[PDB]
């Protein structure tokens, strides 16, 4: 069985683009190559790390389950989750965002340090995707995250990386001078992934449990 994805790319269907999810979903498939790029894939400008590696791993996946790794209301009590939308990801004329990624903003004039983790008990490898925001201007960084020395730390037994986003104005892509770089990792069963950040973090909302046999 193949996986047909609209006009969309692999990133668009896996990131949760507002227009991509309305077309197709699937669990068992063997072919994934539909459209490379320059399509509905990334509604927000950014760089997808290890895109070709993710394409190879995602190819020929027997079982695929979509689950909420972090509930929207429960996971982040001291941050605002409803403020994160953009016109570049607009759906049906209303500003929207990725369905699998949730934008985290400040609440009540503060952005407290966050530490959230997920333990994998699904007996299947879990695909976790997140993003790090790179504001175009320093003033926007202070307004949304209330910190200039932003840090995002994703640490697990198999994967470990610390991101320090830097404010840099970039050429306008999809009416957004700012950028959000996307990163992903695979969580082996029995392992826990830790998220620590003071801001500029696009925390995961939905994850995918997959098997390759």
């Amino acid at each position: 069985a193949p996986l047909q994805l609209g006009n969309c790319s692999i990133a668009g269907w896996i990131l949760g683009n507002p227009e991509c999810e309305s077309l197709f979903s699937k669990e068992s498939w063997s072919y994934i190559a539909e459209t490379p790029n320059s399509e509905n894939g990334t509604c927000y400008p950014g760089y997808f790390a290890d895109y070709e590696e993710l394409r190879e791993q995602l190819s020929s996946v027997s079982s695929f389950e979509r689950f909420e790794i972090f509930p929207k209301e429960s996971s982040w009590p001291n941050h605002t989750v409803t403020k994160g939308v953009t016109a570049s990801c607009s759906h049906n004329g209303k500003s929207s965002f990725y369905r699998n990624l949730l934008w985290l903003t400040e609440k009540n004039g503060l952005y407290p340090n966050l530490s959230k983790s997920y333990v994998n008990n699904k007996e299947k490898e879990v695909l976790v995707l997140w993003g790090v925001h790179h504001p175009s201007n320093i003033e926007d960084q202070r307004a949304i995250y209330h910190t200039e020395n932003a840090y995002v730390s994703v640490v697990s037994s198999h994967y470990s990386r610390r991101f320090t986003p830097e404010i840099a104005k970039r050429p306008k892509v999809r009416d957004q001078e700012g950028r959000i770089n996307y990163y992903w990792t695979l969580l082996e069963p029995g392992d826990t992934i830790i998220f620590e950040a003071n801001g500029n973090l696009i925390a995961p909302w939905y994850a995918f449990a997959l098997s390759r046999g």
């Epitope: 403020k83 016109a87 903003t105 009540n108 003033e139 209330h146």
Partner: antibody
Framework: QVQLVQSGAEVRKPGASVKVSCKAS????????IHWVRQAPGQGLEWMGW????????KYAQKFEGWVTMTRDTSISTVYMELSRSRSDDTAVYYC???????????????????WGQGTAVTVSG | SVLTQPPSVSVAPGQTATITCGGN??????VDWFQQKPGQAPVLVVY???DRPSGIPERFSDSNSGTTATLTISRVEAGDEADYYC???????????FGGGTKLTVLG
């Protein structure tokens, strides 16, 4: 209902310390920013700065930078605005406004000014 | 940023009055309008896209249309006579710059 009651009328000599209070009631004090504007008699509004009760952060305008100072007191839900040095041109009505209008998008993440005070008549012109 | 407003705009009752606020203000940039009656604190009338907050009549509408800010009041009544200001947020300094002000006169 949510309201901001300001201090009474003030008369000062040039170079004096003009301090204006702004008491908040009807809502959680440490929620939104408090903005200060100055209106010369029969003139437009001039933005001075903002202070957030929760964090205490202050960002003043270039015209008012240095000689104005915004403080806060969470115990009494009062924000203060002290002008260290005063002049005749500073004679105006000073308003304190609450930024209770939550934004909608990160592209336009600003807290709009919805609840205003009553004004404080500051006449220096000593 | 600097926002320029006409000193006074005259409209007869029943007609439609348009107040102009100029400057490099991009497409939306919030653009908030305030109403100041004599001897009274300013009150917000429209924010974001239209969005009359509490009791502001539906006759009030805020349309940008390019590098200009426009406030439109239809079927102007006596109560609409006040001074209207335009306010944006310059994201290059996070400063809430106000407009010059417009005295809307309902010709009686």
């Amino acid at each position: 209902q949510v309201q901001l009651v300001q201090s009474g009328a003030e008369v000062r000599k040039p170079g004096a310390s003009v301090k204006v209070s702004c008491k908040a009631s009807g809502y959680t004090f440490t929620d939104n920013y408090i903005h200060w504007v100055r209106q010369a008699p029969g003139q437009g509004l001039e933005w001075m700065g903002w202070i957030h009760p929760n964090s205490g952060a202050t960002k003043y305008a270039q015209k008012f930078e240095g000689w104005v100072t915004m403080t806060r007191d969470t115990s009494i839900s009062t924000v203060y605005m002290e002008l260290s040095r005063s002049r005749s041109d500073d004679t105006a009505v000073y308003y304190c406004a609450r930024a209770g209008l939550e934004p909608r998008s990160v592209d336009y993440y600003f807290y709009g000014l919805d609840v205003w005070g009553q004004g404080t008549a500051v006449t220096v012109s000593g | 940023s600097v926002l320029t407003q006409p000193p006074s705009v005259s409209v007869a009752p029943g007609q439609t009055a348009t107040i102009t606020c100029g400057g490099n203000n991009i497409g939306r940039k919030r653009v908030d309008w305030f109403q100041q009656k004599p001897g009274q604190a300013p009150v917000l009338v429209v924010y974001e896209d239209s969005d009359r907050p509490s009791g502001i009549p539906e006759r009030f509408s805020d349309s940008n249309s390019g590098t200009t800010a426009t406030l439109t009041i239809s079927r102007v009544e006596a109560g609409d006579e006040a001074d209207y200001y335009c306010q944006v947020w310059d994201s290059d300094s996070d400063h809430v710059v106000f407009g010059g002000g417009t005295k809307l006169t309902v010709l009686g």
